[PDB]
Request: fold
Amino acid sequence: PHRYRPGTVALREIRRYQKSTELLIRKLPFQRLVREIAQDFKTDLRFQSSAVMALQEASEAYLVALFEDTNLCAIHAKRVTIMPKDIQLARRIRGER
Amino acid sequence: PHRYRPGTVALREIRRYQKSTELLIRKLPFQRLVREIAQDFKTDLRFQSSAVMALQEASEAYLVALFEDTNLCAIHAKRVTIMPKDIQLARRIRGER
Amino acid sequence: AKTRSSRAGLQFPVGRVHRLLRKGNYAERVGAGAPVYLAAVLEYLTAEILELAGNAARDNKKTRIIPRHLQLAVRNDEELNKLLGRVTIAQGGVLPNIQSVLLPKK
Amino acid sequence: AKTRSSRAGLQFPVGRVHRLLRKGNYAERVGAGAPVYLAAVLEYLTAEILELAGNAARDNKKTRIIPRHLQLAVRNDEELNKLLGRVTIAQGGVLPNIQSVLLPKK
Amino acid sequence: KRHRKVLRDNIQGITKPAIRRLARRGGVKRISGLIYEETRGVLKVFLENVIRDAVTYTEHAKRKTVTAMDVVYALKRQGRTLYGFGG
Amino acid sequence: VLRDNIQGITKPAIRRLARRGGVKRISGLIYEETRGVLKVFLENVIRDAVTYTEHAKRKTVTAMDVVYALKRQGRTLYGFGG
Amino acid sequence: KTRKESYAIYVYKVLKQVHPDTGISSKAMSIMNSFVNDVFERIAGEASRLAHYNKRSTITSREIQTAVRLLLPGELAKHAVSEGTKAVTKYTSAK
Amino acid sequence: KTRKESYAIYVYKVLKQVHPDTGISSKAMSIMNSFVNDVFERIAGEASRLAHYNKRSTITSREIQTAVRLLLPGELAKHAVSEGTKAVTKYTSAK
DNA sequence: ATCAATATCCACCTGCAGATACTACCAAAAGTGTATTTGGAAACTGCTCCATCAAAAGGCATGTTCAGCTGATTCAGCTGAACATGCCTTTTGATGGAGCAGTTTCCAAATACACTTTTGGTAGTATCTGCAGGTGGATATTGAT
DNA sequence: ATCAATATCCACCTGCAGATACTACCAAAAGTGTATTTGGAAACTGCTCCATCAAAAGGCATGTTCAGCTGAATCAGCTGAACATGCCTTTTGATGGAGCAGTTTCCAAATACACTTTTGGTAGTATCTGCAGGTGGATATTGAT
Ligand SMILES: [Mg+2]
Reply:
């Protein structure tokens, strides 16, 4: 029975996802999260579907760019594994704190 | 014969300079640098005294905050010594690179 | 003749704020209450900072507010700090703060 | 009756731009050359991006410029990248980029 | 109107595989197990901030419907300008 | 005893700045890196200030020129007008 | 010679209401003046955008209020809003 | 059935000039439209500020020029400046 | 542990730089009053597109396995902190002059305004085409041995 | 290096979603033309406040020494990647209906003057004082033994 070594499929996935542009979070689950959060601010709101997609494009591009910063913080620490402390450092330096 | 250990005076200095607000670069050399840099954009420039001051205050506030980020970057990598790579990471994450 | 500031109950100049809104190319028209509202908001934030800066003066054995005290006031307050998160107060210095890992080992 | 666009030798609508400068509350008055200069800057910039994006489309054996091509164009160009440094192009993805230490063996 | 379902715990619809994919696009090769909850938290803060301003624009306009434009203006306000939706 | 103007930003001075920044220990190569960073910072800001000066048809950079340049770089400064 | 307007006197008044025995240096006053100018611009700016977004020709206190909500953090917003509403009421019900 | 303006046809014109055999998807066009509006707003805004700072009530091609120098990086600014000067110079001689 | 060097704290003193109070003044807001314009709420209603739902299509959850990464441990050698003072750079202040800024001037270009042409947007109906997603089928890439 | 599992790369291949095409109209642009107002450039000049420099101040360049930090090496432990497996949840196409948005009517509120009163800024002048440094003396910290 055949096995790729840990790290190999990971690099394959990086090339695959760096090549393409489709949204990476499933649509409906994202749409529910948006509605849940909005509802806690104000009841009986509706959303244009393009409003939800806008938030999705923005959130996905925000998360991708944060993961790149995070990856740099891990590598700075001489690791290859991203950890919460890496995200926290990235957000601190960014001024998100 | 009396000698303070490495880091003792450094700590003493952090405390001293964190207490005060005076500028920490001598005014004349900063002024020359400012004039030198400005000469490449326009020749025969004069500077209001307060113009140079404004630049110094802004430049020192900038460098002080960058050293804070730089220091977090050194500590992230489990060091207590700031290095150029720490400044480099801080600037990249800030979006200055 | 009674000024709009006194009418509104404010120290901050409603007339001036109204004028500045007009000549600021903000919109073709400026409503009667807008300068009243804005002046109040401006006065309020001023009071808030002066309150906390006065205190910082007191704590440091002083009666005259200096830029140091304005800095201490702003950065020790989570909300004022956020509002002024991209602002530099000249001659403010920084908060006393050393990372624990840098402390000598007891 | 020659349009102000043809007068200035421009594809971009000088009339439209003059109008938007007025309705936009930027100043009391708008000089006659202002929309001419602006419409040319705008035209220049869009030529710059369509050139580069057109190239990315060709490099990809495609005839139609899609959002990925605009993103490749902007991000691969130092100056466009900085000018749109705080902008997000929907459906653009990212540049292929893997950090060195992440590659296998040695 | 008769009844409308309760929305709870939808943050978990942001699955481990979806997050992993996002990290891949950001060039990440190895992911600690604690990253998934941290990311969920980070995304929530991000959405709350944007939705708050978006909804504020909605209410100011006196609509019940959040528009693409409400979101686009909310993003611009926060220095995360978005092209592709009329903005 | 000729010296570059950037070198006028001395080790002790960069050391003080680092100190106010909470830095305990400083690598030898930091001083040159800092000078480079300061230079890029001043270039970006002065460039914009001078641009304001030229627009106003002056030969003197004013505090306001500088304050406006700082504002547009997202580094608002209080204390010098505006 | 030309008139140099400032919020200094009005800031000094508010200081005296808030700390009657405390003074303020020139530099600190200049900072306070910058602060007032900065917050003015931010609030008026946002109010401008709001009116434009909604095809309105007037900046009303409704736009100032939404602007404040958009720009101030939670608690700061809450008081600013109530201080502002309060001032508009007093101004209306006054001959 | 209200009219919605866009820079589409002008973007398309300019597209044909530079790549005669290349098309553009509607989404890419929408992005191109957003880019033009965005740059417009940033230049007009700098110009607006610049005029105010110099106690001027008129936005002229000179204000736009300084705004372009403030806004665009090095080489894009240089070229934008020539294109704009050229269009104005040409325009002045053409009535 | 003791012990001495030296930093640090605080109470009191005081000159003066920087804050403040006061008067006479004038240009310039800021306010009051009357004539005029219009922006936008409301009220009605066409009609886009949003919530909602039934069926169809593919990604997610879970457990097992072990490769290899992280974090602890130890250690040597490199590299930065500390150290003392006269050389030499910066600070301080005194003095001519450049240019910023205040003032008046006058016209090129600004707004305004009304009929006159042009055009960019849509809207309805039509044919066109680039490429996504399916396939099979030859060429890598990877990891066991 | 050699063999084999499986990912990868094209090349071609049909349907079709989305793009491009006209024919007709039209409201609102944009242009045109003429009368009416004015912003700001241009020219002159008064006086700040800026560059310069002499004398005074006092921070930093310097080389030595070694404390202690950084990074290399080694390795146990365990976390996280890969993949098999079982199947739930999302995606996708179809349809009554809320509210957005389009048009028009009508008034409360805002602009626009001009005129009447005041206030906030400056400026000359004199007046006042909080506190930065200096002193002096006790007490804490740090580092050596
Ligand atoms: Mg809820």
About this structure: Chain A has one domain: 1-97. Strands of chain A lie at 46-47, 81-82. The pocket of magnesium ion is lined by residues A 39-40; E 7 (CB under 6 Å). The radius of gyration of chain A is 17 Å.
